[PDB]
Subunit: 75 residues, 2 copies
């Protein structure tokens, strides 16, 4: 399914994912498309930062949901 | 049977449909004739937005009925 990731500069990137994917897997896809190391990525949905080892379905992230990406250092 | 679809600009398009067709099937016919993706389509009859998985007969939509089409984003 398609989901969106929106950054602090307002940019949106579109990802093709599956509900069984982990948040780490989504970060790897962001690394594939955008060159950002997963350890420099924070993904936020429903107002909370998401844990790398849980799945999109664990967070009820649905088709056409928007995640928010915040970059940070260290890792 | 023949039915009409009227837009917010007042334009009417004519469709040939069957009472057993789903609303999604009508949206696919609108996509065929007019290029609008079904996910950008809202169809309204008797004042209510119609659900994609129900049929024209479920809504008692008869020969020469007019549906109202409202476009929207996201999907």
């Amino acid at each position: 399914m398609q989901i969106f990731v929106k950054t602090l500069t307002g940019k949106t990137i579109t990802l093709e994912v599956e509900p069984s994917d982990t948040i780490e897997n989504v970060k790897a896809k962001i690394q594939d498309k955008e060159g950002i190391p997963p350890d420099q990525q924070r993904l936020i949905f429903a107002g909370k930062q998401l844990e790398d080892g849980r799945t999109l379905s664990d967070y009820n992230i649905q088709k056409e949901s928007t995640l928010h990406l915040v970059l940070r250092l260290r890792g």
